Design a protein around this ligand. Structure first.
Ligand SMILES: [Cl-]
Ligand SMILES: [Cl-]
Ligand code: NA
Length: 129
């Protein structure tokens, strides 16, 4: 599923991401835009053989099991395929664990490079939330 901007914002808010660990909703929408272009089915292979999955490009080296990242951890205790669902629940619950692990949203390179320090509230402007 390819989310609209406000649709995703509303879904993320309902799943408790607005101001989760201090990150306003606009930070999560901006990250999703640049990580996956709002497409729950996005995958991308990394150099080390791991793969990023779903709307927030969660990495199989640490967070989910895809059966082909040797020596990887499965810290969200889910198959990576669950992160590709049109229901964002699994991706959100796993992101909550990632953003709480100490490095905040700096775990998402696109957030660090394209969202951090910007006017992220623009990403939720005009949405009915
Ligand atoms: Cl915001
Ligand atoms: Cl980047
Ligand atoms: Na959803």
């Amino acid at each position: 599923k390819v989310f609209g901007r406000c649709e995703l914002a509303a879904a993320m808010k309902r799943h408790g991401l607005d101001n989760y660990r201090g990150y306003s909703l606009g930070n999560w929408v901006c990250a999703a835009k640049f990580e996956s272009n709002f497409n729950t089915q996005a995958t991308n292979r990394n150099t080390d053989g791991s793969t990023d999955y779903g709307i927030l490009q969660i990495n199989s080296r640490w967070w989910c099991n895809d059966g082909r990242t040797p020596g990887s951890r499965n810290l969200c205790n889910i198959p990576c395929s669950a992160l590709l669902s049109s229901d964002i629940t699994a991706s959100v619950n796993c992101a909550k664990k990632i953003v709480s692990d100490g490095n905040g949203m700096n775990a998402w390179v696109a957030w660090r490079n394209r969202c951090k320090g910007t006017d992220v509230q623009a990403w939720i402007r005009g949405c009915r939330l």
